[PDB]
Amino acid sequence: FVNQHLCGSHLVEALYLVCGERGFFYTP
Amino acid sequence: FVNQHLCGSHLVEALYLVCGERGFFYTP
Amino acid sequence: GIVEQCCTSICSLYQLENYCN
Amino acid sequence: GIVEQCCTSICSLYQLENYCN
């Protein structure tokens, strides 16, 4: 799911799945 | 959509929609 | 944190906006 | 930033992980 163009909600979803309990920052 | 229990992907989605071009940090 | 405020209890716009950049 | 690297071009796990806390 990560090795593609990921935009908007799709990118936030990928960050959520990848980062897990660490969480993440989304800075567009 | 914001005034309810929001967990996991549902919470990240709400942050995405609310914060827009600002982006956000998700720190569970 | 956000999980306690928005997941385990009812979220608010007020609190969500505190996590915007 | 992330939009340029993952939206306008093909993302990678390597780059996504740089945005985890």
Contact yes or no for A24 and B26 at CB 8 A = yes
- CA D15 to CA C8: how far, in whole Å? 31
Cβ within 8 Å of residue B25, ≥6 positions away: A23, A24, A25, A26, C19, C21, D21
Q: Is D10 on the interface with A (CB under 8 A)?
A: yes
Q: What is the amino acid identity at position B27?
A: T
**Technique used to solve these coordinates:** X-ray
Q: Which of A1, A4, A11 best tests the D interface by mutation, with the highest count of D CBs <10 A?
A: A11
Q: What's the Cα-to-Cα distance from B1 to each of B17, B18, B22, C1, D8, rounded to whole Å?
A: 10, 10, 19, 20, 29
Which residue in this structure is represented by tokens 């093909």?
Answer: D10
Please state whether at least 3 CB pairs lie below 8 Å between chains B and A: yes
